[model samples]
Target chain A: MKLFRVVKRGYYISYAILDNSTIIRLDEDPIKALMRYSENKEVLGDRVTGIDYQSLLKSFQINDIRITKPIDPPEVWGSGISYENVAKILGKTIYEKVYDAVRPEIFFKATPNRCVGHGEAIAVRSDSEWTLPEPELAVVLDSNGKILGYTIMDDVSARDLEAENPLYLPQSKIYAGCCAFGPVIVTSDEIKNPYSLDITLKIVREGRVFFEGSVNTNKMRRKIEEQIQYLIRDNPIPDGTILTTGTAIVPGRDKGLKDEDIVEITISNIGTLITPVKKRRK
Target chain B: MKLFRVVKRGYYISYAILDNSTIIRLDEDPIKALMRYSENKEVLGDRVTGIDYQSLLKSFQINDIRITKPIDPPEVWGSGISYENVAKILGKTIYEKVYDAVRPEIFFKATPNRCVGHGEAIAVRSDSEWTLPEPELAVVLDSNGKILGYTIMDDVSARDLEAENPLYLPQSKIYAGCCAFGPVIVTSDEIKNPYSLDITLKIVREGRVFFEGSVNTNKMRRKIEEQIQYLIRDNPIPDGTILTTGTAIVPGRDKGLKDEDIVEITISNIGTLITPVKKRRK
Candidate 1:
C-alpha cells in the first residue's frame, strides 16, 4: 500500500492507495498522518479511512481528487556513494573515500519549495552546461527520525559544475526545482525485503525516448538503515524528513538532461515520479 | 523592537522585546506570526497582539518565560565565502573562485531540531577533534524568501574535518546541535544600512576569556541581499526561513572551543546569541 496527499481546496488531504487502485482519504494531513502513526509505532496503512474510497472514485470525477506534491518534507537530504557506479563516473576518490568510511557522504538537496512532484517541471541550472537526474530510493522518516516508508526521488545534478571541483557541490546539487520527490510513499512493511526492487530511469526528448536504463537495489553497497543512521547521527531532522539513497546506474558523461525532456524514474513497489525538465527562467 | 519565542510550559510562545525590556506576547505561534505577516506583506513589527502583553507577561510569571529558540524555522540555509578571512582559514582558492562568481556558496546548516537557542548547549561531535563557532549576521526571511529581519547566528564548525579535505565539508559543518541561532530576531528596518553593524565573538572558559575577536559587517565582501537572492533564486523557502551571512572574523587557528565553554556571538543591532558548549554524551 502507498500513502499520498493531494490538494483538496486550499488544504492538503491525505490518502492511501490500496490494492484496488483506489485512494482512501485519510483523516489527517500527510505529515500529521505519519506523525500520528509513528507516535504509536504503527504503520500508516493500518489506519485507512473508513470512507468507501472505491465508491468515491466512481462518484467523483478523478479531477475532483487533485494530486499534489505529497507533503513538502521540511528537509530533503542525500547520501553519496551508495552506488559504486556513481564513484566511477566521476573518476574521483571523493565518492569511494566516503563509501567505505564509517561516516557516509551527506549533503543538503532541497527543502520543499525547491522540490516538485510527479507532473511538475524540474530546473536545469543555466550556470552549468551538463545536468542529469539520479533516480534514488528515498527513505521517508518520521518526526522521531525513524524510517517508516520509501518513495522515488530524483536527485537532480549539474554535472559540469561538480566536475569543475568537488567543493562546488552546493552549487551543483541545490537550485530551484532541482529535486523531485514522491508519486507515493510505500510503507516499509509493504516490501517484505529491502533489496529486491528493480529501479529504472528513462529520459525522453522531443516525445521520443532519448535514453533508458535500470538497476536493482541489490546493487546498493550500503543498507537503507545505514544511510539513515549516518544522516541522523548528529543532525536531527524534523518530522517528515526524506533521505535519498544514491543511484547505481549512470549513463555516459555525454548524457545530460535537456529542455522540454521528460525524466521518468520507476521502482517495482513504488509508482513512477515523472518530471519535465526546463532551464531556470531569469 | 525585536521578536522572541520563550519556551512556556511545553510550547514556544511569540513575544516582542521592546527597548524597555518588557516582552509583549503575540497571540499567534511563531510560525503563524510570520506567515500572517507574510500573507499581507506587513512589516512584522506592526503586528503585536491586542491582548495586553504587559499583563500577560506578569500573569505568566516572568520566570515562566524561559528563553527558547526565537523561531523554529524549517530550513536554515547558509551563505559562505562572503568573507576574505573565512577563505584564508579554509586556505583554498575555492572561496575566491566563488567570491567573484555571480552565485555565492550556500549550504544547509540545520533544520530546527538540530538548532539550539540562547543558553542551550551546542554540541561538538564526538567523531570530530577540532571545532569552532562561526559568528555571523543572520537574515530572517518570510515564506516568499523575502528578508524580513535580522538575527545573530553561530555556524559551528569541525575545523579538523574540513581541513583534511575540501570534500569533507558536510562532516565538518553539519551534525547534532552543530548550528546555533538567535537570542532574538531584529526587524530589517531596525538596521538602515546593510554593512554598518559591529560584530563581535568571544569564547569564555574557566571564567576567563579564552578567545576574543571583533569585526564589522562593513567588511563583508558580499552584501546580505545578494546572498538572499542566490538562495531564493529558484527555491522558495517556506515561511520563517533563516539564512546566516558568512562571518568575516575567525578565531586564531590554535583556539578551538572546549567543553564547559560559553560561545557568544553579537551583532550591533541584533542582540547577542550566547550558547553553552558540550560534547555528545554518546
Candidate 2:
C-alpha cells in the first residue's frame, strides 16, 4: 500500500493508493491516519473506502489537484556515515570510526519548514560553492519509534561548508529546502526486504544526466533499530518523525550541484523523488 | 501581560494573566492566539474577556489545574556563545572567533517532546559525566520572525561530550529533557529593553546553594534581532518558534549538575523557571 497527500482547494487531502492503483480518500491526513493505525493493528486497507480517479478527473482537470509530500513530519533527523562505502569514498577516518563505533552519528536535519516535497526546488546555501544531494532510504516512524513506512529522501547538503569545520554542520545540513522527501510512502507490510533495496541517485543538467551513482542498502553497516534506539534513547521524538538513513552514494566535489539541476533519487521498492536545485535567494 | 497554559481535565487550556492578577481564558492556545494577535496588532489585553480567579476556585481545587509551558513551539533553536563572557570562561580561541565572526553559531536545540516546563525535571544524559544548565533569555516568535514574547530557557547541556568533539554538539545539546523554558511568556510590548534585562541562574543541592551565576542581557555581544536575522536567513521557522539566545554565565567544572539538583533561572521582566534534575532512565 502507498500513502500520499495532495493539495486540493489549498488544503492537503491524504489518499492511499493500492497496488491495483485504486485511490482511497483518507478521512484524515496521513499523520493522523498513521496515528490511528498505530493503535488496533489491523488491515488498514479494509478500513478505507476506495474511489475511482478517472471518474473525479472528468469533473476537474488532472492538473487542478497536485500531489504533495506523504506526510508533514513534525521533525526530520539524519544519520551520518551508516554505510562503509561512504567511508571508502570520502576516505575520512572519522567516518570509518563512527561506522565501526557503537553509536552512529545522528543529527537533527530539519523541520517541515526546511523540507520541500517532490517536484519542489531544493535550495543550496548562498555561501556554499559545493553542494550535493545525499539520496537515502528514509523511514517514517511514529512517536514510539515504530517504523510505519519507507520513502526516498534527498538529504541536500552544503559539502564545502561541512568540509570547512565539523561545527559548521548545522549550517551545512540545515537551511531553506535543505531536505526533500516523498513521492509516496510504501508501508512496511508491503516491503519484503528493506535491506536489499537498490538506491540510485542522478543529477541531470541541461536535460542530460551529469552525475549518477548507485548503492545497495546491504552496504549499510548499522541496524535501523539500533540507530533509532540511540536517537530515542534520551530523545523523545514526536509523531510523524522522518529519519533518513545514511547515504552511501556520495557525488564528488567536481560534480557539485548547479542551479536548475534536477536531482532524481530512486529506491527499488519506493518511487523516484525528483527535485530541482536552486541557490538560496538573499 | 503574561501568557501561560494549564493542564485542566487532561487538556491544555491557554490563559493570559494580567500584572494585577486577573486571568483571561484564551479561546485558542498561546500558539494560535499569537498567530491571531500577530495579524490584528491591537491591544491584546483589551480584546480578551477578563475572568476573576476567585470565581473559578468555587468549581475546582486550585491544585487540579497545573501550569505547563506557555506555548507548544513547532521548533526550538539555540544561539551559542553570544556573550563574550562564555569565550572568556572556555578560554578557547574558537569560541572567541565565533563570537566575533560575521555569523554567530546557532543550532537546533529541541522539539516539544524534549522540552519540559517550569515544574518538570530536566534530564542529564547517562553517558555524560559533566552536565550543566545554561540559563538564558528565550524569545518567542511568529512564523514571520516577529518577536512575540520572552521567557526563561535552561539550555541544559553535557559539557564534557561537547569538549571531546565539536561534532558531538548534537549529542551534547539534544536529548530527552535537554531543554526547558517558561513559567510564562511576557509579551514583547511589556519588555521595554530586551537587552537590558538582568538574568540569574542558581543551582540548589540538598536545600543549599551549590552554584550561582548571573549576567545582564546587555553583556550579550550579538543583538537579539541580528542573531534572529542570521537564524532565519535561509531557514523558514514556523509559528511559535522559541529561539533561546546564548548563555553568558559559566560555572566551573567542579560545579557540574547531579541528579536531584534544582535549577532556577530568572530574567528581570520574566518570572523564574525552576526545574529539578534527573538522569535519563533506560
lDDT of 1 at B83: 76
- For model 2 the local lDDT of residue B260 reads 96
* Top-DockQ candidate index: 2
lDDT of 1 by residue, A58-134 (tens): 23214555555778788888877777512121233545556656667778788787888877789898776789899
User: Considering every candidate listed, which one attains the maximal TM-score?
Assistant: 2
User: Residue A150 lDDT in model 2?
Assistant: 89
Q: State TM-scores per candidate.
A: 0.82, 0.85
Q: Give stretches of model 1 more than 4 Å off.
A: A8-14, A17-61, A70-72, A85-92, A143-146, B11-62, B85-92, B143-146, B252-254
- Candidate 1 chain A, which ten residues in sequence have the lowest lDDT sum? A85-94
Question: Which portion of correct inter-chain contacts appears in model 1?
Answer: 0.35
Cα error, residue B237 of model 1, in Å, equals 2.3
Best by lDDT: 2
Q: lDDT for every model?
A: 0.75, 0.80
